[PDB]
Design a protein that fits this description.
The structure is a homodimer. Chain A has about 350 residues and is an alpha/beta fold. Chain A has a single domain, classed as NAD(P)-binding Rossmann-like Domain (Rossmann fold). Chain A is built from 15 helices and 11 strands. In chain A, helix 4 links the parallel strand 4 (about 75-80) and strand 5. In chain A, helix 4 packs parallel to helix 5 (about 150-165) and helix 9 (about 255-265) packs parallel to helix 15 (about 345-355). Chain A: Keywords: Cytoplasm, NAD, NADP, Oxidoreductase. Chain A: Belongs to the short-chain dehydrogenases/reductases (SDR) family. Highly divergent. Chain A: Homodimer.
């Protein structure tokens, strides 16, 4: 006897993991929820124990998708939180199309399709200057799209078309930089920084900040993976949130300089912050020969064995550390009644804690 | 039959007048509220018709203060939202002391004292400003005010709250100096002279993130701390919960006035708005008459020097996490808060 039935596409992702968890809490709106979890890989060891119906499916394969997803006649809400490789139009588009084409004609009580994109929706060729343009940060919803290839635009168009043709409600969610960790999706800014801190500690080296001066001192924002799930569940159940494009972030701002000090304290090591006259260095380049050291750290500290290149994305930290002026606005969600938030500093530390609890660090 | 009785000290202030209105709203927590409002001037025309018991009292004059407030024995909550000097270490502290000294012995059901200061407490520290930040080594009288608050409440079994509002967006006819009124006056003059809305500030302040607080939200925040046990005995920041940029405020302001704007120009450096409006006093008098406005003198409605400070300010964002983690979920969209303040001045015919 479930009140609502979720199809979570990308259940192995960082947000998809949070959804499967949050949807199954006893107090969750729309509940009690039944949850199907779709991903490409064979059923993970991590999701196996969970009250989630795992479905292994390559959703780029339409025929396989029809076979696996057509029998699911009871679906009421689709949460599409999947993304595969790079930012590629046609591949993500076909996957999204395949999901809808398989479920829509088969789920008679389907109500809502939640589509997750991201703040990269707002990104163009140019950095923001002194002129005033609706595309400036703080990024707000319901601005015109940039005339630039953006695979998020394709996904949105498919969403609007299919839900419009079939009398379904929709919601688009644009999460900021995600703080989170999933054993099936290890790549994240938090895990990357934690691996660096671990390596520094192992080598008896200080936590040396390699990034630019601007990224050290400028305001930044992010979103906790659990908050994204809460936000998507809110839009799935609350009539006020229906047919809305919505940003999703923690509701506050932070500075990498403050995160850095917290990171060093959590690891019990010294830090070197930005040094005047010492320009940005590539963390990816600094870590390029550390794969073997990571394997040694893993065995010495009895960690779940991971390969360095699979748990850390140092290049992505390099991007974050030369980024600026990317704040997104949460006003629309708040004006619509969604009051979820996180303290970003506590959110960062709690992600570290989760990595510890899973013995990845 | 009132549930709580408020003493609002500085009721003609921007936050004070907000407190007067919000406290009397039908569903205000801790209500129904009875409201005493204290200020120096005779009862203003603007608060005359309002359900507020107005008391004229110069709270620096102790004798007058004891005379006027001691009989008010039904007071349950004190909202001290008064400030008088540019920076008077001794005057502001004596004012606050006299209030406490005159009310505490006589109000047997006094529960809580709300002290309002501001983010100037932090600046200097780096931002985002958080409440746990220790005081700077500087004669700040916020420190003095806080110290008086802590011990008088400590000695008398009263709860306390300290509120540090960011830059205030708001308007009061009895306290017209605000960034919003200042910028609207400039826009009005520009429009009158068939000139564009020219931005005089620095590049950084044009492009950087800034934050502010609606005066009505400060009122709600202070009321919340006065009634919610979770909020008791806490230092609390108060801002709108979002960020904005002056560049966007500027364009919005120009659109609202239906005029062209000249934003920051890459080469140019900051010019004094105060110096720009040097000899516009007579021009303002002509605008007032031509547009049938409530008569104000330029030097009374605008504070161009303060806009000049805002327009060379940067890195001043404050955090609202502590209030939110304690259960306060009030917010404002800062852009809409700015426009709402314009509309209010328009409704009162100041512009």
């Amino acid at each position: 006897s479930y009140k609502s039935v979720a199809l979570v596409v990308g259940v192995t992702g960082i947000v998809g993991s949070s959804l499967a968890e949050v949807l199954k809490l006893p107090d969750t709106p729309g509940g009690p929820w039944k949850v199907y979890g779709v991903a490409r890989r064979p059923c993970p060891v991590w999701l196996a124990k969970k009250p989630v119906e795992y479905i292994q499916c390559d959703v780029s394969d339409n025929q396989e998708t029809i076979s696996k997803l057509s029998p699911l006649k009871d679906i009421t809400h689709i949460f599409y939180v999947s993304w595969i490789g790079s930012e590629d139009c046609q591949t993500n588009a076909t996957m999204f199309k395949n999901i809808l084409n398989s479920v829509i004609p088969n789920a008679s009580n389907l109500q809502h399709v939640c589509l997750q994109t991201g703040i990269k929706h707002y990104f163009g060729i140019f950095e923001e200057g002194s002129k005033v343009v609706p595309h400036d940060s703080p990024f707000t919803e319901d601005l015109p799209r940039l005339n630039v290839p953006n695979f998020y635009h394709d996904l949105e168009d498919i969403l609007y078309e299919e839900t419009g043709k079939n009398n379904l409600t929709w919601s688009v969610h644009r999460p900021a930089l995600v703080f989170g960790f999933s054993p099936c999706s290890m790549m994240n800014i938090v895990s990357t920084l934690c691996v660096y801190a671990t390596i520094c500690k192992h080598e008896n080296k200080a936590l040396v900040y390699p990034g630019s001066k601007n990224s050290w001192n400028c305001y930044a924002d992010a979103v906790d993976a659990d908050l994204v799930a809460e936000h998507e569940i809110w839009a799935a159940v609350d009539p006020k949130a229906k047919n809305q494009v919505l940003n999703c972030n923690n509701g506050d701002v932070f500075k990498w300089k403050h995160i850095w000090k917290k990171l060093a304290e959590e690891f019990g090591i010294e830090m070197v912050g930005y040094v005047e006259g010492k320009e940005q260095v590539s963390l990816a380049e600094l870590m390029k020969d550390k794969d073997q050291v990571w394997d040694e750290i893993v065995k010495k500290n009895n960690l779940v064995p991971t390969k360095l290149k699979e748990i850390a994305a140092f290049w992505f930290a390099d991007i974050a550390f030369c980024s600026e002026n990317l704040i997104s606005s949460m006003n629309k969600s708040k004006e619509l009644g969604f009051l979820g938030f996180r303290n970003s500093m506590k959110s960062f530390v709690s992600c570290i804690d989760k990595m510890r609890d899973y013995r990845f660090i």
